[PDB]
Write a protein that binds this DNA or RNA. Sequence first.
RNA 1: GCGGCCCGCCGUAA
RNA 2: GCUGCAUGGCUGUCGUCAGCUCGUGUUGUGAAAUGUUGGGUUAAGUCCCGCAACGAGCGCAACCCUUAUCCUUUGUUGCCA
RNA 3: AAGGCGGCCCCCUGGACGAAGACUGACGCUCAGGUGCGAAAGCGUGGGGAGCAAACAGGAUUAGAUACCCUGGUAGUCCACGCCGUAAACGAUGUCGACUUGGAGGUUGUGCCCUUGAGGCGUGGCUUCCGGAGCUAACGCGUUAAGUCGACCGCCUGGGG
RNA 4: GGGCGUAAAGCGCACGCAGGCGGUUUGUUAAGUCAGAUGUGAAAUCCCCGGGCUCAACCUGGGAACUGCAUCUGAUACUGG
Lengths: 218, 157, 207
Amino acid sequence: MLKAGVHFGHQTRYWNPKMKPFIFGARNKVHIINLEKTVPMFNEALAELNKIASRKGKILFVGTKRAASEAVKDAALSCDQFFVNHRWLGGMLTNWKTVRQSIKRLKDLETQSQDGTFDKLTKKEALMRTRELEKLENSLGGIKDMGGLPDALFVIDADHEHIAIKEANNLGIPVFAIVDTNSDPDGVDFVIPGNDDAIRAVTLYLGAVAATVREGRS
Amino acid sequence: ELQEKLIAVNRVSKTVKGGRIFSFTALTVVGDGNGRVGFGYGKAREVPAAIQKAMEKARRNMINVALNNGTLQHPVKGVHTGSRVFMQPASEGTGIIAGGAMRAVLEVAGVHNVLAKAYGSTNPINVVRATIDGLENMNSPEMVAAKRGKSVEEILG
Amino acid sequence: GQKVHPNGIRLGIVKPWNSTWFANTKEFADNLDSDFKVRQYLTKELAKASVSRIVIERPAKSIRVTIHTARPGIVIGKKGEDVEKLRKVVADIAGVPAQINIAEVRKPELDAKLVADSITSQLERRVMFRRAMKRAVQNAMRLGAKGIKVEVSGRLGGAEIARTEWYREGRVPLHTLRADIDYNTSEAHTTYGVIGVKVWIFKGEIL
RNA sequence: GCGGCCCGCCGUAA
RNA sequence: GCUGCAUGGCUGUCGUCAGCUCGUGUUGUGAAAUGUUGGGUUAAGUCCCGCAACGAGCGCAACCCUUAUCCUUUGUUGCCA
RNA sequence: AAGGCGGCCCCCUGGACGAAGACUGACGCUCAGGUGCGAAAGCGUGGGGAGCAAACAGGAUUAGAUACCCUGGUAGUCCACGCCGUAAACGAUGUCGACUUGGAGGUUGUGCCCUUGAGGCGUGGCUUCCGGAGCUAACGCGUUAAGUCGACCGCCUGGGG
RNA sequence: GGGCGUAAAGCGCACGCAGGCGGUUUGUUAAGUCAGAUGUGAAAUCCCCGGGCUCAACCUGGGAACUGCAUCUGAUACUGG
């Protein structure tokens, strides 16, 4: 808000013209974001998805870009929320009735952790079964027991996750995204201008969101 | 309660090393009583599967249109890639006069007194866009006044 | 001619036989002739009954016949009069004493021979081929099976060349021998020509 | 990086 | 006796070649494409990594027979330490 | 302006462009018919002829070779003065004027800040390549539009014939 | 109520008479332009409101139009002088 610990856009060379009114005059050939404008609608957007948490929003977080990949899971599971952090699959929301059976497969496999070698002690099956179970939970760790159709959705990087945003528009799911100077507002524009490729900024954003969502229920 | 119609079933072929493989495609339109309408095109290997595969995908995409007493007063003209269409409202007592696909669409849409003509190509798929052609851009008498910041009387004059 | 026959390749591993007995090289021919005569004679009149297979065994001194049917009521008829007539006529066929035993088919939509007979009898009376095989597959999968495949070929009412269609569900792996496949065939003397039917049922692996 | 080598009767499978 | 150019079954054939397809979802008005492609590997669509694909079926291998080493049960018509 | 233009030096001569200032006061845009300029080849008269090379002659290859390959070789290609008036004369896109998100460059004027240098703030002209909305049957075009408009002109109406 | 990049279609390129089009005002002008009224646009046909033949085709009564043309006056936003 006033701490001025958030960096700014990538570079005037790589800039999206659709973000003209969210910019400041460059002085070192690097775009500067307009923090005087980021704060108001950021808070007014925190408001409703704090209210949405009162309706069991079942919000998700996408941070599969290795800059905030470890940070998203920290804010995830804080109160109740969930996340995905490796290999966003294509259409697991639109094609949820198919990828659901993968969650069922994992829910059948992890029981065999209690008895998967004592039924039969063949060493060949153990290695590949373990690798298959580990692979299945690597991308479905935060979704291992969801019911489906999350109500809200939060995005770290817009263009890097344009597939998710496009998969959200068709189903009428509100979207909350951190948009840098290269991306553009296309989806459900609860736009959150700010530097996406900055660990300090993304951690601050995630902390603010996690604190905000916590009081949604109670 | 929803009204469904089947229009076209044509065989479509593809050639491979072993020879030619055939397929069937069907185009169907689904409409409500008074304003909801949608269409679906579905590939399949057999005709009944094509029908049962186009029906549900036509059911999902329903779009609403504003109309009063089986019409709405607007001289609307619709354009697409290859086909060009034009329709205007009728007074009363007149039935529905239009082409083949146009007849089905205007019938299940809810309109009961309209006049229409089809120009250009007569392929059913492009003219099926008669819905998207004008009905999507159909204008509401009170919405014009609302966006102009006036009441309905002054707009009517 | 492309496919080896599933039954023969599994006869000794995961399949029983239809006539298990012993006879030296001298009496092989007459024994086989008697077997064939009895089998065909029984199959003639019992066509109305849902006869699946006939088993013949010779305990080195006698002839015994086993009949598998889902409809024992007509198989025996009102009472033992039908069975007594069959036993006496087969004793006329083979002078050695004969015993008749009746088995039970619990699932008529199993026993690929039975479903083949049902579908060919349906096709006998001028019904389009799609519905019959479709409903047969629906019934087969409804009762629980890990695979099903049906084949039909011949003059399907058109003067053009004979075509061939097949619908399949589940797994029917014929290259694995432990898997048990119920495969049989039948034909109908249709007006336009003889039409053959083939059915495969994968009940499950035998370990 | 450079030698050369021609033709295939009329209609036909839904 | 006529009709394989009306037909069931039965064979040859490319070829024991490693390919051939489907369900759902996304891409184009459309025929269609994706999956089945790219990096590396296998006898092999055999596998690993990456990827709008996620999974499935026939296929591949295996489960069959015989043979290559010894272990147990038993010695006639078969063996002679 | 289009066809097109290349060693160096001199003589005559045309156009565009930039910065600034002064002046005239709508004197403008497009044009049926008319007028002029148009690559290569070709024609006429008089000169010239190194190299190359239609026609032509031998030698090869080939079933045959009239050709592709080799050895020769006249017209022509060159100059002066006159004709001819056609080219895939193609960006296969007619000439003017106005409006519409970006970029990377190249070449050529000009201004202000340490001009220290090759820094950056710009600011006109013409050019090259990607690309959004939009348009298109698609391919694609996209401020040098095939996007949104106005003025004038020239052409089109199934394939052969 | 069509088109000219690849389906038919932009003259090889320029100059330019007659023609078509005209930046921004100020005042006159009433030419075009807009509003009236006056006279015609015969009859016959068509429409409308009706009638008589057993309704009906057939005939008849009245209104509508006869989209134009001519004259006088008014309007001066726009184009023209």
